[model samples]
Target chain A: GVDLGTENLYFSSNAMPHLRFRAVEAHIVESLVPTLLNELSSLLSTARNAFTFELINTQYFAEGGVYPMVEVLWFGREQQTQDQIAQVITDQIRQLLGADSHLAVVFIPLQRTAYYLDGQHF
Target chain B: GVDLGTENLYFSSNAMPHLRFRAVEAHIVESLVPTLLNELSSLLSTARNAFTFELINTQYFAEGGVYPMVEVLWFGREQQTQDQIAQVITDQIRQLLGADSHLAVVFIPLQRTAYYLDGQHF
Candidate 1:
């Protein structure tokens, strides 16, 4: 009572193989795309306070060097509060890199993250 | 051109050897104690807003596990500003662990640091 044709068998095998690739693509489109979109929207919403991406990029390059120093400057009331925020980001990075990696982070009450990149000194 | 006695030689050899140990001890004491004192004093100065040591211990356990999630909850008007401080502390720990090869640190609003020695879990 089973009618399994060659076309059906070929489709079942070949088409099924593509299902994994399609699923991966769908996952990227659904999960990653939406999350990125949401992040963009959130960044846009706080555009007034958020640092410009260009400035961040410049600082990233500036700080990239042997023992690259990343300085985060904050300007606002409650200096301790700002310092606490800086600490959290640093902790997250430590957790990511583990206890072996080397990183230097400093805080100043200016406004921006500055870096000393490779082939540069300051 | 100077005549050195056996007592002087013994004293110099034995005493001089002790000097290295003393020097190492002095280095640890001088560098570590004052820094710890300064940190304690700084913590005490902000006693009012800083969380109590007992509460911090409890939270440390509550947050400790697989990833050992340590939360730095900031409470202040400027949330972003508060966050920056936490980041600074975290970064400093990373830098110290990298540069000094001595310390590892964590920042939390709850106050005090706790460790889960060997076989304890909670």
Candidate 2:
């Protein structure tokens, strides 16, 4: 079994549960990074220190049409958990837009060995 | 065998070379995002359209000291390839800073099933 302990101060907060807190990268069209951050703070039900969020302003292209799209990158979770999270996140964005839109919520698993903190391999 | 074909216009460029171009998210001190982007463009030897780069300004803390840190999140490559790439990326950052520094380059594999391009699962 993988030991989840870490000496890294970044993950040492008391509020951080035994499971690793995942980071989020959201490529949003409406420049609503702050809005999404606020929602996630409530949605994840964890301290702000437990997660890292980055929002990029960009657009996506499709042969069918040039559409406004939102792409979110989430990290390391069970497939079922990710599905639930995706649904909620998509719904939140839809509510923010007040319309159904082109959005993708992707969950990429982060193997423990792949993560390093300040030169210390995790 | 996994088919690398994509109908998404983002990865349809001839320059993409059939392999998915991974996105990079770098958190660094000294504000060197543009400099790293230039280096990676040459180092990766691919068209700018092939990759997504996002740079976040941040710091890291340790019991020893609050130190400047460079963290790079790369995606989906063989272990040996990731090791070689990490060595080169660390070297590039050191050269830019004109000194060896605390840095880590992480490679997180992006499973094809986990990637969605504008609501289309890859």
Candidate 3:
């Protein structure tokens, strides 16, 4: 399965509460990941508008505050790809919101998974 | 048996430096707890006019920072007895040092207990 690493995309507008865009594997197959590509295209289209966009790692919430762990993960494969995608998304977000508009985005990743077995099962 | 909970007592003064009086179960019978009693007498005989004494709980050092846990225990059984004893010592120390002198006393106690059982027994 193509793990389009970008799990959750967050957007905050000075005028709006907030918006979240989650990039799923399905989006990649159905629209050639138009949602992901649109992120960049959107920013480029509105580059002259007044707005800003920031990409954040989801770990900030899961682990609480900015931690070295987040930095470590930021350099991870998923993070690197997300960064590239964010650059494009940000450009589009900025264009749509306005080149000078305030915008910020963050990516947070889940740290752990749990497995449980009962009785004689694995 | 009056289980005096007072575990540790500490005293400090600008003149003679620091002193500690511990009340162990054994001290109660050997010398009417002379060690504990003597603590008061010593302060009375050395009462000074230019020294100060303040009492503190051991928990302050153990728990990182002062917390309600320490405060709660301070008002518990061990702490109460220590407070009374401390008052008497303070009074005597002040008198010996010359009335209007400075003296303080604090009592601290252990909060929890642990028990180990035999290999196959309770």
Candidate 4:
């Protein structure tokens, strides 16, 4: 059953929205680390460009080796157009970073600020 | 109610351990990003050293202004001493990034791979 009261509370407590992206392969550390970070900061800045970026969390998985096999998270705003932004970044990788650098981008959208599991809430 | 079955499932799905920290000021990013990141990559690393870092997620809360106001997430390993690592980063901030950069480091530890809240799990 949809409790009207719970829905109202959800609206107030839902996590603020933001854009999140993942970068796999080499340049993630080389080009994307802070350099690409400087290229575009705030997802909103992509408009005029603010250089406002904050790394939320990160995880690592070793494929062939560990050095280059890593992932990243970049925050995005509510305006959308993550597609266009990825294009700009792709071009920059070829130009500023390098095609050989191997930078693949995936932008993730943020939703909740909490976690849940098996009949329990945290 | 002891549910051994669910506990086993939880064990498999529990989130990996990584240091997650929040930066309340400017330098959280400026210096700590590529520079400090280059200094230490894997959380378990600070050893002989390997430059491995992944940025997961980020959030913004307006303080005085928005530009310098952002939080960051840095991954840590099962190894202890996230505090010592922060100390090393702090000293570097003063020396390399600049005392005026005003960077504050907070290392957050990861729990579950997911978020739980309000009588529900997602």
What fraction of correct interface contacts does each candidate retain?
0.00, 0.04, 0.00, 0.00
Worst 10 residues of 2 chain A by lDDT: A12-21
* Lowest-sum lDDT 10-residue window in model 4 chain B: B62-71
lDDT tens readout by residue for model 4, B1-122: 33344332233223223333332223243445566655554443333222333443344332221222122243343335656666666676455323443445554543433433344332
Off by over 4 Å in 1: A1-49, A53-65, A111-122, B1-122
| lDDT, candidate 3, B1-122, per-residue tens | 22234222222211222234221111112322334345643643434322222232221111111111111112123345446556665554433222433333444443222211133211
DockQ of all models, two decimals each: 0.01, 0.02, 0.00, 0.01
- Model 2 C-alpha RMSD vs. true structure (Å) is 21.2
> How good is the docking of model 2, as DockQ?
0.02
lDDT score, candidate 3, position B50 = 22
Chain A TM-score for each of the predictions: 0.33, 0.56, 0.32, 0.37
**Model 4 CA deviation exceeding 4 Å by range:** A1-122, B1-34, B41-61, B66-80, B95-97, B112-122
Per-candidate TM-scores read 0.21, 0.35, 0.19, 0.26
- Residues B39-89 of candidate 2: C-alpha lDDT, one tens digit per residue: 665755556555554444333343322223334433345566556556665
**Candidates 1 and 4: which is better by lDDT?**
4
Model 3 lDDT, full chain set: 0.30
TM-score (chain A only) of candidate 2: 0.56
Structural similarity of chain A in candidate 1, as TM-score = 0.33
Root-mean-square deviation of Cα positions for candidate 3 versus the true structure, in angstroms: 23.8
Candidate 4, lDDT over the whole model: 0.39
Question: Which portions of model 2 show Cα errors greater than 4 Å?
Answer: A1-122, B1-31, B57-59, B66-75
Write the number of the candidate with greater DockQ, choosing between 1 and 2: 2
lDDT of 1 by residue, B1-122 (tens): 22243233212112111000110112232333334334533532333222222112111111111111123332222445444434443344333222212222233332112222143311
